[PDB]
Structure formats: structure tokens, C-alpha cells
Symmetry: D4
Subunit: 121 residues, 8 copies
Amino acid sequence: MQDTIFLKGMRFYGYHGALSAENEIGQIFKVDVTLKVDLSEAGRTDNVIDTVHYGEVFEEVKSIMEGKAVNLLEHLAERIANRINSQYNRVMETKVRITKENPPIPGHYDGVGIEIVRENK
Amino acid sequence: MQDTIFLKGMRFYGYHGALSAENEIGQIFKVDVTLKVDLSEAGRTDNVIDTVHYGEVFEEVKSIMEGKAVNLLEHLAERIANRINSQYNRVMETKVRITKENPPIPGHYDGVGIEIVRENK
Amino acid sequence: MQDTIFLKGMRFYGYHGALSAENEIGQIFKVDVTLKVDLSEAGRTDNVIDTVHYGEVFEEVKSIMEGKAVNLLEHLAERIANRINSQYNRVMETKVRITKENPPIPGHYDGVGIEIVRENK
Amino acid sequence: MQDTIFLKGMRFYGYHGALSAENEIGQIFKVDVTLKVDLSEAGRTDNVIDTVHYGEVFEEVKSIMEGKAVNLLEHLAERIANRINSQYNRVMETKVRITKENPPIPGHYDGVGIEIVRENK
Amino acid sequence: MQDTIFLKGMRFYGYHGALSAENEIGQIFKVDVTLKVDLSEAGRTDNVIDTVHYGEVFEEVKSIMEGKAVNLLEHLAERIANRINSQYNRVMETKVRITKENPPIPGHYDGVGIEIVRENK
Amino acid sequence: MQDTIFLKGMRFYGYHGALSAENEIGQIFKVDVTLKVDLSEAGRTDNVIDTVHYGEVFEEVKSIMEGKAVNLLEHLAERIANRINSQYNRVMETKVRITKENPPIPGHYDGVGIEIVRENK
Amino acid sequence: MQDTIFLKGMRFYGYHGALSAENEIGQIFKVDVTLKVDLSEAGRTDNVIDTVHYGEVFEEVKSIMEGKAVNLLEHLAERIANRINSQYNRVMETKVRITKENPPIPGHYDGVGIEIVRENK
Amino acid sequence: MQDTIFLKGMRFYGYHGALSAENEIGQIFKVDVTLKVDLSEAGRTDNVIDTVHYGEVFEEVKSIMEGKAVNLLEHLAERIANRINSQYNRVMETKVRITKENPPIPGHYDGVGIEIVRENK
């Protein structure tokens, strides 16, 4: 089953980071969420109730990304995957990618970050 | 067998969406279609009749994307995969990705959407 | 005097537009603000008090862009130019460019919008 | 008076070109239209009737770009400027830029084209 | 063994295509070549003779892409894979992706094309 | 008179540069040419003979850019402007911009170069 | 005289900013330098000694951008313009644009900054 | 286990290359590093000590990329993978991709390079 629902390049200004100065200044966090969902029923019915609504997922991601500052991207993604998996039984698995395009790293690069994949129990 | 025929970033202005206001205003839908097709005969012959012509596939996608408004991206992709699989026996499997880069979601992101993979029976 | 202070590509999700459905759904508005300010005193002193702080300008633009929905981009820009000119005497002139990259226009384009230039009286 | 109304990156698939093969195959034409219009009345009133509506301008450009094939970009732009100037008295001047990003020129480049500026008589 | 040598976005102006007018006008062809090669010996030695030189591969691709016009992308890629596999025993497998970003297809898209994967016998 | 004919982002691999190693290795040179030409006759007539054909201009630029290596971008642009001005009396003035996106400069930047403007005598 | 020598998108990781936390963490600063220089002698001679060498200019910009942290972009640009004007008599005027693409501003934008123009006395 | 820590588009100006002239002039090297690391402990704890810090990894990559010039990209990547695997036991496997976007290859392309994957022993 290779069907997926996705939200790409969601950007949020947050205050996460292990560094005091990061928590103070903040920075933009980029998030990609890919959900493993069987979309054949919805494909047949065209009824919004047979799939997972992207809008609701974005709201979840946003509440976590723009909420309380934490140290790690690993913890933020863990919270998001866990939030999506808990509320939607149709989601078989949640992939969360978080990128800091402008972390406190003296250099030239496109971004740094983490990606996790959590199956829905 | 890893050969594929592809059509990337096809853009169509349509009126699909579960929201009345979406159906009224419309928006751009981005579509990626990847077809699993054995291309060694055509690679040998160079005869257009031994492969699936991209132009015809684009026409199919377009007729569905620019036709009657439906609620879901899942239904549109289901219709496209089913259209391509039905008309081309050489297509072993059809992957359809549809992205709403500007849905009615208050936020900053690159796009939201779905992706399905349907084997040709 | 060709010195300027600028804020490029500020994006805000708003509900402006002459169309009911626009006011309901909203869309992203892109804003560029260019301020004609003599920067030689600040260039000499390095004292933040001798120039116009970008951060404060962004806050002004944001309050207008994310506030009450209006019909026209012309009115939004008029309000922004007028806001910046009123609060900063050092600003000799304000240029405001607002772009709707995804208006209710059935077609393929990069964006539509307006640009105004208002001297500070 | 430096106020302007603009439409950027409008893309149309057309058949214009001095070459038979161009007329047969077609290609994408990119168009930028910038209109010199005094926007202070609309800025004050917020009444759509005090400005030139972008949507109507796009429709004009489209009718010309997707209509009968002509040889030159110069002729297409002349027709567009003349169309906009004729129908909108508030437009003091019309700038039309047309780019062929993929003309029949053996080489590597971003685009070729013309730009004209026509005052409204 | 997941090591690879790659050449991305190689662009050539050619005359391939099943349509007479294409053969006459030409267009840009974009090519991506990915080679499965064990790079640990070279990683150890740092001796250019223990790997496949990208420069030579580009020359091969170029000779085929800028040579005689053929009808299909499938045939061009077949010729390239076969050329690379024949001359380099260290290449375990060759992936060739060819994209026509501007084919004779009336529409808005990013590109169309094919991708093949050929193991070296 | 603000009409112009333009050729943007023309790329050529050349061997120009004041450094021996540059002459040996080469690099990509990006060229923008803007020609001041009155386009109203052509706009009226639609006859290709009343304007300057972009294709011929590209050929001129190419012959100079891909010809004998010289030390300076200033000399290459001088030769191009002079070539275009000499052969086309309708060109009132020629602007030539040449950019070395990857010169032998240890750093991170988008490009370096020169731009000249030469009126046709 | 419209000839210019330019350096675009020079990026440096620095510690400038009026905020303590900025000085601590740092961020990327983007710089554009445009120099008004008469390039006809060099265009004629092709002798590197008749123009201003971009490489030397980049070194100057770099020494200032990667040196001691200051509060304002206005002061950094003033120092750069003054450095270039002092060392090169052929430079008739120096334009310096500095952009903070990721300042401590909670929002979504492309960049903020200043631009100055200083004639060489 | 599909969790990863990544650093994308790290750019360094170096002097690597099998060609004398490359070693003399240098060029920009683009590096992508993807690390297979189990991030569930850190996801739970939010303690920076339970994961691999990106900042330290960037420093390692940088020391190798900006250090002594070597002939091959294969050798540079081998050194990086080996450096990361040696210092971090939590890294189960290291993927290193190095791209020369502007090698001494007369042509038009996006980049050439190699990618290796090394499991941590």
C-alpha cells in the first residue's frame, strides 16, 4: 500500500533550540509530514469523511511548532507523529521531517534537521 | 523492471474542493504522473508504436483535471490512474500525485496533497 | 539621495478581496516595502537611534495585512504608506508593492498586484 | 506619479512565430504587463470602481495571446498595449513585455523577447 | 552496495522527436545519469584510475544527445546506457533519465520524459 | 523611446580570464543583451523585416563568447556591443551584461561581472 | 556613463546586529556591490590594469563583513563604500546593498536590509 | 528503523581535483550528509545528549572539505563517512553525497558527483 497524504514546506517561526540565544531570537522551522493512508475508499466515494483532512493535520503541526519551546527537533517531531497517529486511526504510519534552514552554525548550507517515521499502533 | 515514463508539474486551474468557496473561486492543481512501462522494445526499435505517448497521457490528465469539479484529490487521482490503466495495457502501474499549492489553509507552506499508486489489472 | 531601507517578500495570510469567496477563504499576500531614508548619520554613528528599525516597520505592515479585510490592494498599500510616513519623520518617501500570487483568476501567471509611492509630508 | 498595477509571468501556449514549424508546434509565451494608473482615489475609497481590475486585463491579454497566430512578439505586444489603452482611460501608459523562453534558437539561455511602452492617448 | 557516481541536469540542444517539426526546430533535452559503482577502492587510494571519470561519461552522453536525431527518448537512453555499460566494467548498472521540458504539448507543466535502468552484463 | 529587444541568461562555456588556469579549465559565462530598438513599425506591420531578429543577435554573441579567449569581460562586452551596433542600424544603443558565476574567488556569492552601455553611432 | 562592475549575492556569516543574542549566534549577511566605472579603456586594451579587479573588491567586502561585529547594516555598508572609494580612483561611485534574510523578526519574508550609494570624492 | 539526522547543501570552497589547474583555482563543493540514527530516546527525553549534534557533524565535514586538497570526491567522502562513524557510535550508517556544480567539463549541466553509504562498524 503506497498511498500517502502529504503537507510540504510548512513554515513556522518558533523558539526551539538547545541554545539560550535561539530560544530568545527564534528562527523559521520547515516541516514536511507524509502520512501512509489507504485512499481507495475516498477515491471511490469522493466523500471527505473517508480520508484524513490536510487542514486538520496542519492545525496539529502548527499547535506544536508554534507552542512551547523545546530543545530538540527530535522531540518536536515525536510529539507531531504521536499527535497525528493518536487522532487518526486511518493513518497507518507518520513521517515527520523538520529542517532548520538557519541554525546557529557558522557556515554555508541549505539546512540541517531530522526525519522520523512512526507507525500507528 | 524500473523503467518509467513521467509527466512532471502539470498545472491546471480547476474548481475541485470540499468547500463551496473553493468550487466558486478555483485554484491551480499540480499533477505528477509516473508510469511503470517496459521501455526496452522501444529502446531497440525507436518506433513510437512500442511505447506510451506522453502527449496522449497529458490529454487524459487534462480532461479529468479541467472537467467537472469533485470534492477530493483522492477521487481525481483515482479517476486518472483508472483512465491511464484502462487505455494502456503496457502500463504495469500508475502513480498519480496531486498537490494543492494554495488551499484554503491559513498558513505558510509549499503545498498539500496526496499520492496514489494503482497497478494495472 | 539614493539610500533606502527595505523589507522584501513579507508574506501574510489575509482575507482581502472584492469577492465574497475571497473574504471567506483568504490567500497569501506578498508585500515589498522600500523606504527612502538618509543613512549617512547611522553609517557614521552605528547607533540604532539614527535610523528606522526594520522590525518596527514589519510590525506595522503585519498589523494592516493581518487585520480587517478590505476590498483593494490599493487601500491596503495606502494605509501602510500612510502608517510608515506618519510614524517616521526620517522616511522621506514610502514605496509599497503588494502581490496576489494566487488571485481568483483562471490562468497561469506568477502574480498580479499594485505598487504605490507616497512622499512623506 | 509612480503608481502601477501589474500582472507578472502570465503564461500562454500559443502558435506565434515567423517560422512555419513554430506555428505548427507552438510554445509557451511569458507576458508581463505594467500599467501606469493613479491609485490614490481607490486607496482612499476602497471602491473597486475607482481602479482598473487585474482580472479584466488578464482576460484581454489572454484573448490576444491565445488567439490567431502572428509572426512577431512586437505585433502581439502592440495589440495588447493598444487593447488596454483603448478600454481604460485611467491607464496613463501601458508596458508590455513578452518572452519566448524556448524559441527555435540552438543554445542555452533563459529567454529572448521584447518590451514596449505605449502612452494612452 | 549503494555507492553511485552521478551527472545531473546535463542540457543539450537536439533534434529528436517523432514530429517532423520537432526535428526541424529542435529543443533542449535534460539528462540525468546515475551509475552504480563500488567507490571504496578509490576512496582508499585517491587514485583517479580506480573510479569512473565523470568527464568521460559526459562526453559519451553528449555525443549521443547532440548526434543524429532519433524519434524516441527511449532509444536515446538505451543508446547511452548501452554506451556506458560497454566501456566501463566497474559500472554495475546505469540509470538514464531524459526530460523534454518543452515538448509540443499545449499546456503548463514542468517536463515530460522517461527513465530506464540497465544492469551491466 | 523605451522599447527594447532582449536576450536573457545566454550561457556559454569559454576560456576567458586573466589567469592562466582559467584559460586552461574554462567556466560558464552568463550574458544579457538589451537592445534599444523602436518596435512600432514592426508592431504595425508584423513583418519580420522591420525589426532586429533575436536569433541573429544570439549567433553574434555566441561567436564572440565561444571564440578566442581574452583576459577581460570588459573586452568581450565591448566586442559584442560593437558587433551588434555595427550590423544593425535600427539598434540605437546596446547594453551588454556578462557574469562569471564561478570565478576563481574563494567565497560564497551569486556572481561577479560587468555591464556596459554603448550607443550606436 | 552607465558602465558598472558588480559582485552579486556575496554571503558571509557574521555577528552584526543591535541585539546581544544576534552578536552571540550570528547569521548570514547577503551583499551586493555595484561600482560605477568607465570600462571603455579596458574594453579597448584588454589589459587587466585598466579596470578594477572584482577579486580585490570581494576581499575588501569580506574583511569588513567577517570582521568586528557592529550594530548596523548602515555602518557596515558605509565602511565598505568608503573602503572601495578610497582605494580605487576609477570608481566614480559605490552602491552597497546588505540583506539580512533571517533577522530576529517573527514572520515570513524574503529579507530585510538597506542600500546606500556613495560617490567617490 | 528509518530515522535520520541530515545536513543539506553544505558548501565549501576547496582545491580538490585530479587536475593541476583545479588545485590552483579551486571551486565550490556541495555536500549532503545523512545519518541513520535512532531518535526515539531523544524524542522522549528532549535531552541534547541522547542524539548526535548537527553542529559537530558540520565541523567535521568542514575540516575535511576545507583541508588538504585530494584528487577524488570518493576519497573526501570516504574520509567524512569514516570520521562520522568513528566518533559517533549512535550513527548506524553514514551517507555522504558530494557534488561539483562547476567542474572543468565544457558543457551545460547542474552538477556531477558521487554518493557513498558506509555502515558504522
